[PDB]
Structures are given as structure tokens and as C-alpha cells.
RNA sequence: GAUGUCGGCUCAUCACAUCCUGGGGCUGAAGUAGGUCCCAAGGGUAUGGCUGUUCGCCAUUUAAAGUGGUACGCGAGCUGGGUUUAGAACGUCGUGAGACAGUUCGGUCCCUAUCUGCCGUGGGCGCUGGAGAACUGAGGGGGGCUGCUCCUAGUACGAGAGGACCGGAGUGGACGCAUCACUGGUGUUCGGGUUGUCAUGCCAAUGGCACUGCCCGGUAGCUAAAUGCGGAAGAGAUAAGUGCUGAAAGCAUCUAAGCACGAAACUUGCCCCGAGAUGAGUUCUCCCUGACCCUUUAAGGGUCCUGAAGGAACGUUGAAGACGACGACGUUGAUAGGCCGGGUGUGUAAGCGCAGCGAUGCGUUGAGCUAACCGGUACUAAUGAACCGUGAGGCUUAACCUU
RNA sequence: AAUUCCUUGUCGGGUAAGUUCCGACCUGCACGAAUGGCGUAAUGAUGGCCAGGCUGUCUCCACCCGAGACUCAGUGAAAUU
RNA sequence: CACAGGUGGUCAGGUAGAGAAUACCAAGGCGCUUGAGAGAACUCGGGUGAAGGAACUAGGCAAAAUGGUGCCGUAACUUC
RNA sequence: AGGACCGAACCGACUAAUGUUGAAAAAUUAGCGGAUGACUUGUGGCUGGGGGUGAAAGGCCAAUCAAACCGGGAGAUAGCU
């Protein structure tokens, strides 16, 4: 959700 | 033509009288003995066998005792071969001695290299280490990409055993030749540690 | 009911529509230096400043600083500046919530590799008696770059200025392998100085702890920035291209038959692996020359005796090594450790004595200590053994024995 | 300009070379005066830029001391299929 | 969870030090419920470094050192 | 004297690395910022779900917040898998 897996 | 086999007894400086060091591989090439001599009758080759050094009564096998009994020769340390240039005559029980390099000026070693053990990619490939800071995560001296978007091309340079293999330089220039001591002083450095077997023969590259 | 996106870093790889080097044709090619086109992909093919940038401009180099494909190669390899969340401002639009391919500051990038594949390294079996070595080399990799300077020659050319191919020599850059003698780094296993502090009863003298307490030096070993070598020459067949002879086609023509030149490509030669090359190779040497039974009577099975050549295991170990492996030795023995001597390094120990008010200094003394190194030494430990694998090596054919 | 599309505006300074930075000009795509304007000493784990010093950040990595990785005995795990 | 976790109060030794910092100790309490051997790549945590010294990179992250006491001395600007 | 200075406890959490089936469902190590104050802390108590509280972030309200948890309406409805 945050941008690239997970940030 | 032919060579021989000598021991890598280390290395030293050759001073001359204009005050010139000249690098130097000392070696100790003990008198040489023929074992074998092969043609093409046989065989289908023009060689030669060649041991030296010697070694113990109750250590050498039954089968080598009459190989080297055969020749009437003492036993050795090993074994090797030469090939002959269509113009080379010996003949078992033969012994050879260091002079054979006398008026040659020029010859092409080899011998076994050092053990390095398993070794990376820079110690082997020269490969050019990574970042160690400014984000860097556990990839300091590794390789990086080895392929693309499927399979690694076969002889990729990768990390492996370095070393404990065979080395041949070439084209070492000869300083001097003492038969009296059965040395032979050839410029720069060799393969092999000291104590280590190694092959001696004239240069072909001239 | 998930194929993670620019650029950088790293590691690369192929194509040739060639950037350089190589080989040629025409040239409005005098020469030097260029232009154009052909053959050629062997190797090689900048660093930095600004910018997130690729690109691009700029500076300075280089023989040249190639064009492209590989998920605009490569995030289960790194990065996360940019793109691409939530935060907050400017400009602008909207009454407003909010929004913009407008800008600006800030902002968690996970995965122990099952298979394939790749780099390395071993076991087992096989190759037909078995074992121990040395080879053949089918095949497969590596390597293949290049500048400058001098002579040839201030020659040919040219009015001068200017300034050669051909051929030879030397010296360099980058890359690559090996090596540690030299120059050096490292050296928490050597020595010494020294702060604070605890302890060894105390002084003296030592040791521990504090990043090895902080520092100065430095053996072996490893290692590069250090020093030696290397790219080739040569050969054969060729590309573009140039040809001799020569008809078809009375002449002409490099070609159709024939024949001679021809490049860093290709095949060779240089280096390494290499007989699992199941097409499983070749040479030398060594060891085994039993008594019977029974049986679907056979490449049959089992028992008693026999147990070699050699190997393995074990052990002491290695400038060999992740483990296996490889190498050396095992009392007929220097394999390791210790011990003796020596060298190197550290830098005048301790103790006593002398001087001085004392801290300290001097003499004994270039003293004592000293790791892995050199040369020697059986003092200790590597044990007699047993464990291991056998007993003449099939059938057929041809030639020999008994040419 | 935390605002400027054209744009790395133009000139100058600094650098061997500066799309960034500072100082000026104004052609203000689309600043503007309490949703405040222009300044402002000091302050700031604030943003941007240039220096000195310092260094293995790098050129180009090398060696060493430790903890793992590796082997042995013991226990014995987890994810996908 | 036999957890690198959190926390309210009280007692507060000696040497050095300004100090409840820090370093070594006392009292007293522990060595952290698997270990042995080897001494490869690579990773983690650290130490040293030839010559150059930010050329690295989007951007100088860490390290080291400046680091303490006393004395001299001390710019622009300023709300003094 | 000081919403003053350096700096431990204490309270915080700017940067980096490790870790990321972790020792740990937000930590560790190295440094870092405030440290007589708008400071911090113990015990107890009160403000309560379209409401509370909020030096304001759509932050917190028992590891859950653009409308908590539990139960019930309830087998909500699902022209979609
Ligand atoms: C605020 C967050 C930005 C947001 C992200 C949305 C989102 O849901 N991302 C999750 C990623 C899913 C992935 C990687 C799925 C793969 O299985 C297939 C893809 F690979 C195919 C593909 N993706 C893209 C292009 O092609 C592609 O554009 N994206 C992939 C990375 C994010 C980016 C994207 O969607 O960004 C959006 C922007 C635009 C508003």
C-alpha cells in the first residue's frame, strides 16, 4: 500500500 | 629440445659488477636419469622418460622397482616425459646433467601454483567491489547480475578453487650454471612454493 | 486470485548497418592529412564538472572514446536520487471539499535456493583377471589491443612550406598469469615505551582490565602500489581486391578448364583441462599356477585350505584444504612438536654495585627476550597387528604353437 | 522567488569545466501587503551552496582479531507443494 | 516464551575525577541450559594502511581527530 | 534571575547499519535532541462511539479508528467470483 512491497 | 626437472629451492639477488640486481629463481636440478625410451613401433611418439631424486627402499611399489630395475636405475621421486624434435637420441641409464642448458640463454618453466583454496571473484577475476557504504545491504564484494531476463552461460566467471594447478611461464632469461652444484639461475619468478617439482625447457617464443 | 517501473552500481552477452587497429578499389589521391565505397566483429573501445537523470553542454584526454538486441539486459544481485501513498507550503483552478504531469521539503525495497542452469569439488559403478604409474589427444576452453621515439630519411614527392608507405629497433599505457628476492602494507601468536587502576604481603620486579587500554617498531605468511614473463613470429586454406595464360565470341577479357598473390576473421602453431573419447584407447612393470562335493550340469552353486601385488583404514601432518580430495612420513623413521645452535626483530633485561638530595643516570651489557623462518637432533608421539581385496582370467573366428 | 511555462532566462562571481548556489537586471506564463508584505540579530537533530581540516567514500582494494557460514555428536524447527 | 522488553521507590563503599559520568576494584552476586574441532567464499561487528585525499555519491554515512584545564586573544552584524 | 549554557539519571527518538519466518507483531548498537520546565513521573479519579479527546496528525480512544469492541436485527443484499 505504501509504495514498494510494504514500505 | 628436451628438458628437465629441477626443485624450486627459493629465490635470491644477483648482484653484477656495473651494481645491477638481477632478480633470480634458484633451482636444484639433480642429475637426471633416462628410464623409458619410446618410438614408434610400439608406441607411435618419439619421447623419452626422465625420473630423479631418489626416495625409500620400503616405501616404493613392486611395480616401479622393476620399471626403474628394468633400466638398471636407481628409483625416483616421480615421472615425466619429453617429446624429441625428430632429431634427439638417448638411451636408458643415461644420466643428464645441468649443462644441457649451457648455450641456450632462454627457457619456459612450469610447475604447480600456490594453493589459494575456494576464492572469490575478486581475488580471482579481479572483480570490482561494490559500494561499502551509501546504501550498501549485504553486498559489499559480491558478484551483482550473472545472467538476464534464462540461464547462466557456461563459463561465467564465478568463485571456485584458485590455484593447485598447472602454470607454465615462458621466455625466462638465464643468468648462470653451475654443474659443480647442479643449479640453474634463471631470471624472475616461478610457479610453485619451495620444495616443489617443476619443469625446465629451452623457449620456443625465441 | 500481482509479469515490481527511469537512472546509477555490478556482472555481462550476442548482432554488424565498423569508432580505432588490419586488408583494399576510385579519388577533383602530389606528399602529409582527408573524402567515398568494399571485405572484416579477433581484441579493444575516457575520466570529471552541472543535473535524479539517460541524453545533452562544458573542461581535459585517448589510436579510438562505435551503433544496437538481450522484459528500453540485470531490484529472490545492491541502490532508492526520480517516478508512485498518507504530511505540510507557493503558484494556479474551484464558492468549497480538493485538484494539477506545475514546483518545493520530508518519507519501512522482505524471502535460510527444491528443480533447471552456472562456478567449483567428491562418492559409486563401468571400461571384462586385478592392481600401480607414465602417455596418446578425439574434443573443449584461455589468449589475440595498442601508442610513442630513433634509424632507414630530412630521403621519394613538392616551387616552397611541409614531410612517407614498405622494413628494423627500443621503450611505454591498459589488461592478464605467476611470484615475495628487492621497495612496502598487514602482522590482536615477538619486543619495548606508557596513562589510570586492582592484585601478587610490602619495596623492587611482574600480571590482569580498560577498542590489542592508547602508541612506536617489527619475523614468517598473505599481499600490491612492488618486479619478471606474456600478446607474436611462422605455416595452410581464404574475404574484398589485384593477376598470368586463355577460349567461348578469329580481337578483347582474372575463368569457363588450368595457375599465382591476398587481412588482427576462420583452421594451425603458444597455454590449461582432457580416454565416462560407454567409439570407454596405448606402453612398461608387479602379484595369484589349490582339494573336493553336490547340483534345473551351467559364464552354475557351496564348503575346507589359501589371502599375495596393492589398496584402504588409523596415526603424525602439509607453502593441500570448507567437508571429501591431493601430498609427505609411520621406529629399516626427521612427519609434526619439543630441545640444541644460528639468524631476524626489539633495543643495553633482572639482580647487585657506583654517583646523585632525589627523580634518574652510568657499569656489569648490544644485555635479555624472541611467533610461524634456516640448519640439525628420535626426547615424546606416528604400535606388532587385525579389518580390506584371491586363486590364471569367457565364447567365436583368423593367423600362429606344429612359418 | 518553497511561486517563472518558454528556461540550464541574460550578465557577472566562484570552479580547469557549475541545469545547482550567491549577487543584479525584469520579458512578474501565474508575487503582493494581517488566508499579511519587505526586512530581521539570535536560535534550528531544518533546506540549498562553497571552503579549511580529516579520512579506505573512492582510485584499488590488501592483511589481521572476533561472531556465523563449513565438519562432528545432540535436539530439531518453521514458509511452498 | 526460562523474552537482548518495560519500571515506582529506598540503601549509595575505595582509587583517579568537577561528578550518581567514565576506568579498575570492595561488599556481595554472576559467567547469561548445548558444545567440540576447523580456521574457505560471503555476511555481520571491529582494527591498521603505502601514495593521492571527496576524484566516491542523488548527497561527505560512519571512523578518526579537533575534544580537557589555565592564560593571552577574538570579525562582520546586532534588538547592545 | 533565566520556557538560559555544557552535561548523567530521567523523558524523548534526527541519522546510519543490523535485524526483516527478527532476541523483539517497531527493537538493538553507534552516535543524537531537551535535561528548573509549556518538564517529567507514581497512585487514584472523570469527559465516552457520529461521541470523547486532540499545541490539529484525521492523530489517539486496550497490538483494531474517514466513525471502537461485543451481541442482536441476520442466513443484510451481492444483476459479481
Ligand atoms: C500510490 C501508489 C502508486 C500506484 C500503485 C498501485 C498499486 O496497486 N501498485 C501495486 C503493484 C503491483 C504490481 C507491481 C503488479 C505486477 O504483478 C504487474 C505490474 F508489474 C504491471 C505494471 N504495473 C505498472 C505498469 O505495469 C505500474 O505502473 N506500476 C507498478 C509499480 C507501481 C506502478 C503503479 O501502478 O503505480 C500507481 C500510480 C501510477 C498511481
Same mark, same amino acid.
Given at each position: 500500500x505504501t509504495x514498494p512491497f510494504x514500505x | 629440445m628436451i628438458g628437465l626437472v629441477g626443485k624450486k629451492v627459493g629465490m635470491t639477488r644477483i648482484f653484477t659488477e656495473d651494481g645491477v640486481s638481477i632478480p633470480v629463481t634458484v633451482?636444484? @636440478?639433480?642429475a637426471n636419469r633416462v628410464t623409458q625410451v619410446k618410438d614408434l613401433?610400439?608406441?607411435?611418439y618419439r619421447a623419452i622418460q626422465v625420473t630423479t631424486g631418489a626416495k625409500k627402499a620400503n616405501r616404493v611399489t613392486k611395480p616401479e622397482a622393476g620399471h626403474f630395475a628394468k633400466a638398471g636405475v636407481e628409483a625416483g621421486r616421480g615421472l615425466w616425459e619429453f617429446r624429441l624434435a625428430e632429431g634427439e637420441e638417448f638411451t636408458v641409464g643415461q644420466s643428464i646433467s645441468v649443462?644441457?642448458?649451457?648455450? @641456450?640463454k632462454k627457457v619456459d618453466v612450469t610447475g604447480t601454483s600456490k594453493g589459494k583454496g575456494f576464492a572469490g571473484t575478486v581475488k580471482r577475476w579481479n572483480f570490482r567491489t561494490q559500494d561499502?557504504?551509501?546504501?550498501?545491504?549485504?553486498?559489499?564484494?559480491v558478484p551483482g547480475s550473472?545472467?538476464?531476463?534464462?540461464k547462466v552461460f557456461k563459463g561465467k566467471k564465478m568463485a571456485g578453487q584458485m590455484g593447485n594447478e598447472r602454470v607454465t611461464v615462458q621466455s625466462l632469461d638465464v643468468v648462470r650454471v653451475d654443474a659443480e652444484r647442479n643449479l640453474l639461475l634463471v631470471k624472475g619468478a616461478v610457479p610453485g612454493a619451495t620444495g616443489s617439482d617443476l619443469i625446465v625447457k629451452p623457449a620456443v617464443k625465441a
Open positions: - | 633451482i636444484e @636440478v639433480e613401433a610400439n608406441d607411435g649443462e644441457l642448458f649451457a648455450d @641456450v561499502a557504504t551509501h546504501g550498501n545491504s549485504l553486498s559489499h564484494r550473472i545472467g538476464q531476463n534464462g
